[PDB]
Design a protein around this ligand. Sequence first.
Ligand SMILES: CC[C@H](C)c1nccs1
Length: 156
Amino acid sequence: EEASSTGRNFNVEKINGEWHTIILASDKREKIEDNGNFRLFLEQIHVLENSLVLKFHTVRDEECSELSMVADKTEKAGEYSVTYDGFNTFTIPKTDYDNFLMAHLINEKDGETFQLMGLYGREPDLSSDIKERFAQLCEEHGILRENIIDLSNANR
Ligand SMILES: CC[C@H](C)c1nccs1
């Protein structure tokens, strides 16, 4: 079964648990490159009543560092917000709960905005068909292939 956080049939409780960053894409490529502060490796999502606890790690020359954030529900169904290097709001355009999850985020800081989309998996890698389906969604949002980074061999 596939759902959108924006849909009426979305069951947030089902995204609880372990996840992995598989692919990241952005409007502004430098934010997800090597020393980018948005190059985050998701490890777990803990679902709360009106919030989402997010646990990640960042990596610098293979050294990993823990990072946690709490995203709160906004007034729009299926949308959360979190303050991190500016103000961010995000939704989950597509997920099947037990395999993949696609996220869409908009960052705003000092009159400037950029978008970030990510593909996460319950396992550290996903099939090529799902990866290509993600590339197609990125295209719909105006993000081209040169700005999509597959991190499946850098996510552990
Ligand atoms: C679900 C993961 C989303 C896209 C986030 N990345 C940075 C802050 S929230």
